């Protein structure tokens, strides 16, 4: 439960995303919107279209938060507290949606980083995302 070998697989993997972090973030979002249309309801005010700039901008924000999370794996609830308030109290995002986003992020990583997305890495990534997700919905538990 973010476990020593888990970071490092996470840290290394986030490492190769590097400068692409934002575009992968946007891709994951677009992937989520198309596969799980119910999710688009939370973004009334956006242009959810492909290539969309707002989605591009949002992608960056999402990716930046994840980078900060990786950099703070051991202190995730303090580091993500504001986001937790936003997501649970303000937006009331359905907890299920976090699993969908997480899934779509993995899909994005697998498609872009074949050589890095090994089974072991996939597993660490999955737990990392689940732990981020738990923090983000902590306000309902």
């Amino acid at each position: 439960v973010l476990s020593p070998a888990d970071k490092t697989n996470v840290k290394a993997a986030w490492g190769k995303v590097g400068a692409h972090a934002g575009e992968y973030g946007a891709e994951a979002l677009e992937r989520m919107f198309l596969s799980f249309p119910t999710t688009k309801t939370y973004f009334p005010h956006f242009d959810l279209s492909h290539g969309s700039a707002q989605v591009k901008g949002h992608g960056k924000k999402v990716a930046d938060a994840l980078t900060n999370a990786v950099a703070h794996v051991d202190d995730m609830p303090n580091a993500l507290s504001a986001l937790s308030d936003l997501h649970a109290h303000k937006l009331r995002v359905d907890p299920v949606n976090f699993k969908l986003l997480s899934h779509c992020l993995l899909v994005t990583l697998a498609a872009h980083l074949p050589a890095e997305f090994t089974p072991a890495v996939h597993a660490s990534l999955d737990k990392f995302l689940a732990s981020v997700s738990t923090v983000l919905t902590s306000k309902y538990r």
């Binding site: 993995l106 899909v107 498609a111 872009h112 997305f117």
Partner: protein
């Protein structure tokens, strides 16, 4: 499941390039590695103690191929999914006692494996169609549980 015409086509195009010896083993293997409780069902398969142990496991690989065979079947009968998976449903419920949530997990792992293999070719709209397919298979397998 309801696929548009573009989707049916996209699904078909990709499936044709899928390596049937490998993909099934990969998907099954990753399921065992990512969701460890699933190992309970494959305890007599040998060493499952590490990611490489699971993935290169001859029995996992062999079993993955059958699993993939069944998916192929579903793809070829999108309009009669329940009929197609009727015996497999009974088998998974009555004999193996697998919770149906695991069919959803396997379908998603499968999606990650298709992405891994096809990279950029596995676009967002293609993934969406595949998501509809895997959700349909999971549902058809859960049919005899109620």
């Amino acid at each position: 499941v309801h696929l548009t015409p573009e989707e049916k086509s996209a699904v078909t195009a990709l499936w044709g390039k899928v390596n049937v010896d490998e993909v099934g083993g990969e998907a099954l293997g990753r399921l065992l590695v990512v969701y460890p409780w699933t190992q309970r069902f494959f305890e007599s398969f040998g060493d499952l103690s590490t990611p490489d142990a699971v993935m290169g496991n001859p029995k996992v690989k062999a079993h993955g191929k059958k699993v993939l065979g069944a998916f192929s079947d579903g793809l070829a009968h999108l309009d009669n999914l329940k009929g197609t998976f009727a015996t497999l449903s009974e088998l998974h419920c009555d004999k193996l006692h697998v919770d149906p949530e695991n069919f959803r997990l396997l379908g998603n792992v499968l999606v990650c494996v298709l992405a891994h293999h096809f990279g950029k070719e596995f676009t967002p709209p293609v993934q969406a169609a595949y998501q509809k397919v895997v959700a349909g298979v999971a549902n058809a397998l859960a049919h005899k549980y109620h």
